[PDB]
Amino acid sequence: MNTVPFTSAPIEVTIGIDQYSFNVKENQPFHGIKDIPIGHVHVIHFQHADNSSMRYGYWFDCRMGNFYIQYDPKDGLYKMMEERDGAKFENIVHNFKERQMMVSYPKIDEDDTWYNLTEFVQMDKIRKIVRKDENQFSYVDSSMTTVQENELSDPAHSLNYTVINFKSREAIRPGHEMEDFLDKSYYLNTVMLQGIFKNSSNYFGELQFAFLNAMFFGNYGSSLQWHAMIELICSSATVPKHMLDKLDEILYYQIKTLPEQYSDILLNERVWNICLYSSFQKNSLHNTEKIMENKYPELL
Amino acid sequence: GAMNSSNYAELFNNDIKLFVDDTNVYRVTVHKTFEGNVATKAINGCIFTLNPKTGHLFLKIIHTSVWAGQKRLSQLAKWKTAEEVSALVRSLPKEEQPKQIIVTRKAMLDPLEVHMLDFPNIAIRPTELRLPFSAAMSIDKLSDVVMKATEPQMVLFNIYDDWLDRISSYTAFSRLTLLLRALKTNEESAKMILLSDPTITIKSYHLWPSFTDEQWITIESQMRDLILTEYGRKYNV
Ligand SMILES: CCCS(=O)(=O)Nc1cc(N)c(F)cc1F
Ligand SMILES: CCCS(=O)(=O)Nc1cc(N)c(F)cc1F
């Protein structure tokens, strides 16, 4: 179990760690988060009390380094930093754990939620969507635009998700216009899976990362990407059976975890109705359809 | 975006544009089978592709063989339309190419956009106008060439005959749409008005009779009356 030490908490802020969150009062004696499960990526995120605009945060993997948070009063935010001196870090947490100034990652043993939401998400793929090669962790916030959004302004601050566009030469083979537009299997299987992602695990990883950025930061471009990756599978008549079964599990846990009161903005009526009721795979997402119907019957 | 009454003079400016109407692509009669079930029989159809500035009609005849062994024909017909319009654009030289294609039915947008991916600078637009181009098959010479076709064929016509020698494109389009609206609302009466007078003939190379300017005024008035007379029956007003 690993730890992320905070220098302090000088401004009042709501701190999240994965699907949990804590309110920290201005100059309350908060020095970090302990007992973080090893084996998964994690995200530590922030929303300041005095300006709820800009949710922001950091994707990290404790196996890749020792990371701590310190507030910067010039740039006005909590920054993640990497400590190269193992022993210094090791003894700091020790002082802070001994004075009981850390909250504990509150993981119920029975609970597989975070694993289920990050099953295919890997730090190495995050760092290629979020390009800042001098850090081992990746900053994301509410306002960052995606490459696709930019095409339709600062590139170094972009979310480099894979561009998906159903009315593009990439999606449509010359001579198979109607076929490819009505059945997206060649775009899914040959262009995207075999060509760009190489396998279904990397495709699901980006889909899961997009959902998590949409949920945790209200990142609208990430929400677009999540729905696009869902629609591309559901709009394909030929999908490997293991992918349909895995997709049903992935979406079930995403819909399970979504705050009920965020459904309006985060869920796109057109995509979900098409996917559950109209598409080729309308009968392949039994768990997702059941949780959607019992939890958000209005949307449909 | 969409073409309507606000931006209507745009049709007669010098940017090449083409209306595309797919109403008459897939044409069927519905009938009873021996077992008392219902079946369709297709007849030849046509794509109506019209430059409104010049009167140029690219009439692509859609032969019933297109449909052989195909399913979901009403869906296929939109894609076939889009395929043929794309092929037409590719066939024309650069300076004869449309800068916009206006589809009369919004369901044509996606099929045509997908077939025109190689032409990103040709705008594909819908229209809010109700245009009467379905009535093209009430024009005798157009109906005849479609029905007699034995294979896919493109036939070219000028739908304004020689009118542009004497009137503007705006006025020619107004006359065309009035005639077609009349033929659509009451074909029998409209044709009676056009052919009532033995002394007025249709040139071999024309679609409409050779009326003087003054006779066109009378004819146009009679077509307006026909349209109102018919309307007071539909709605009982
Ligand atoms: C000199 C350290 C100030 S502190 O309060 O210990 N913050 C902190 C500082 C460093 N360098 C770190 F590795 C971990 C920490 F949590
Ligand atoms: C070439 C003249 C043949 S026509 O049917 O009289 N008019 C005509 C028709 C079309 N479609 C055109 F592109 C150019 C034309 F002049």
CATH classification of the domain holding A234? 1.25.40.550
Instruction: Please state how this structure was obtained.
Output: X-ray
Cα A122 to Cα A42: distance, rounded to the nearest angstrom: 10
Same domain for B50 and B132: yes
Write down the residue that tokens 């749409």 correspond to.
Answer: B177
Same domain for A127 and A35: yes
Residue B4 in domain = no
Same domain for A218 and A159: yes
Cα B159 to Cα A227: distance, rounded to the nearest angstrom: 47
Same domain for A266 and A128: no
User: Which of A181, A183, A235 to mutate against chain B (most B CBs within 10 Å)?
Assistant: A181
| Last residue of one domain, picked from the residues A143, A166, A181 | A143
- How many angstroms separate the CA of residue B114 from the nearest CA in chain A? 6
Same domain for B154 and B169: no
- Residue A277 structure tokens: 């009721």
Same domain for A172 and A133: no
* CB contacts, 8 Å: A178 with chain B: 76, 79, 111, 114
Pairing of strands A32-36, A103-104: parallel
A249 CA from centroid of ligand 2 (Å): 60
- Radius of gyration, CA atoms only, chain A: 20
Same domain for B21 and B136: yes
Ligand 1 contact via A248 beta carbon (within 6 Å): no
CA-to-CA dists, residue A142 to A12, A155, A215, angstroms: 19, 16, 10
Judge: B117–A178 Cβ closer than 8 Å, yes or no.
no
- CB of B28 closer than 8 Å to CB of B40: yes
Angle at B177 between CA B172 and CA B183, to 5 degrees: 130
* CB contacts, 8 Å: A168 with chain B: 117
Of all residues in chain A, the one with the smallest CA distance to B110 is A167
Q: Is A139 helix (H, G, I), strand (E, B) or coil?
A: strand
Q: Residue B133: which domain range?
A: 9-163
Write down the residue that tokens 């795979």 correspond to.
Answer: A281
Same domain for B40 and B150: yes
Same domain for A238 and A101: no
Q: Determine the residue of B48, B50, B56, B161 to mutate for testing ligand 2's pocket, defined as the one with the most ligand atoms within 8 A of the Cβ atom.
A: B56
* CB contacts, 8 Å: B79 with chain A: 177-178
Q: What is the resolution of this structure in A?
A: 1.6
Same domain for A134 and A96: yes
- CB of A40 closer than 8 Å to CB of A118: yes
Q: Which residue is closest in CA terms to ligand 2's atom 10?
A: B56
Residue B63 in domain = yes
Residue ranges lining ligand 2, Cβ < 6 Å: B 56-58, 156-158
What DSSP designation does A49 have?
A: S
Judge: B115–A169 Cβ closer than 8 Å, yes or no.
no
Ligand in nearest proximity to the CA of A93: 1
Residue A209 has a CB neighbour count (10 Å cut-off) of 29
- Which of B162, B27, B120, B212 is closest to A165 using CA atoms? B120
Same domain for A114 and A231: no
Residue B118 in domain = yes
Residue B2 in domain = no
Total tally of structural domains belonging to chain A: 2
Residues 6 or more apart whose Cβ sits within 8 Å of residue A264: none
Q: Residue A101: which domain range?
A: 1-143
Q: E-strand spans in chain A?
A: 2-5, 13-17, 20-24, 32-36, 42-48, 55-60, 67-72, 77-82, 103-104, 138-141
- Residue A98 structure tokens: 């001994």
Same domain for B112 and B25: yes
Judge: A167–B76 Cβ closer than 8 Å, yes or no.
no
**CATH number, residue B92:** 3.30.420.230
- Residue B36 structure tokens: 């008392």
Same domain for B172 and B156: no
Same domain for A194 and A165: yes
| Last residue of one domain, picked from the residues A94, A112, A143 | A143
| Last residue of one domain, picked from the residues B132, B163, B194 | B163
Angle at B50 between CA B45 and CA B53, to 5 degrees: 165
- CB of B220 closer than 8 Å to CB of B177: no
Same domain for B157 and B87: yes
**CATH number, residue A84:** 2.60.34.20
Ligand 1 contact via A83 beta carbon (within 6 Å): yes
Residue B26 in domain = yes
| Last residue of one domain, picked from the residues A92, A118, A143 | A143
**CATH number, residue B204:** 1.20.80.40
Ligand in nearest proximity to the CA of A6: 1
* CB contacts, 8 Å: B82 with chain A: 177
HEC states along chain B?
A: CCECCCCHHHHHCCCCEEEEECCCCCEEEEEECCCCCEEEEEECEEEEEEECCCCEEEEEEECHHHHCCCCCHHHHHHHHHHHHHHHHHHHCCHHHCCCEEEECCHHHHHHHHHHCCCCCCCEEECECCCCCHHHHHHCHHHHHHHHHCCCCEEEEEECCCCHHHCCCHHHHHHHHHHHHHHHHHCHHHHHHHHHCCCCCCCCCCCCCCCCCHHHHHHHHHHHHHHHHHHHHHHCCC
Residue B23 in domain = yes
Of all residues in chain B, the one with the smallest CA distance to A170 is B117
Judge: A178–B79 Cβ closer than 8 Å, yes or no.
yes
- CB of B137 closer than 8 Å to CB of B146: yes
Judge: B117–A181 Cβ closer than 8 Å, yes or no.
no
- Which of A20, A32, A4 is closest to A107 using CA atoms? A20
Cα B24 to Cα B133: distance, rounded to the nearest angstrom: 9
Same domain for B129 and B183: no
Same domain for B172 and B136: no
Angle between helices B187-195 and B213-234 (to 10 degrees): 160
Residues 6 or more apart whose Cβ sits within 8 Å of residue B183: B132, B135, B138, B139, B190, B191
| Interface size, chain A vs chain B, as Cβ–Cβ contacts under 8 Å | 22
CB crowding B189-204: b at 16 or more within 10 Å, else e:
bbeebbeeeeeeeeee
Pairing of strands A138-141, A55-60: antiparallel
* CB contacts, 8 Å: A177 with chain B: 79, 82-83, 111, 114-115
Q: Which residues of chain A have a Cβ shorter than 8 Å from any chain B Cβ?
A: 167-169, 172, 177-178, 181
Same domain for B113 and B217: no
**Per-state percent for chain A, helix, strand, coil, to nearest 5:** 45, 20, 40
Region of residue A164 (phi > 0: left; psi between -120 and 50: alpha; otherwise: beta): beta
Ligand in nearest proximity to the CA of A4: 1
Residue B171 in domain = yes
B157 CA from centroid of ligand 2 (Å): 5
Total tally of structural domains belonging to chain B: 2
Query: How far is C-alpha A48 from the geometric centre of its chain's CA atoms?
Result: 20
Residue A246 has a CB neighbour count (10 Å cut-off) of 16
Q: Which residues of chain B have a Cβ shorter than 8 Å from any chain A Cβ?
A: 76, 79, 82-83, 110-111, 113-115, 117-118
Same domain for B215 and B155: no
Same domain for B222 and B141: no
Judge: A167–B110 Cβ closer than 8 Å, yes or no.
yes
Same domain for A131 and A151: no
Same domain for A183 and A156: yes
Region of residue A294 (phi > 0: left; psi between -120 and 50: alpha; otherwise: beta): alpha
Same domain for A187 and A62: no
Same domain for A196 and A110: no
Residue B62 in domain = yes
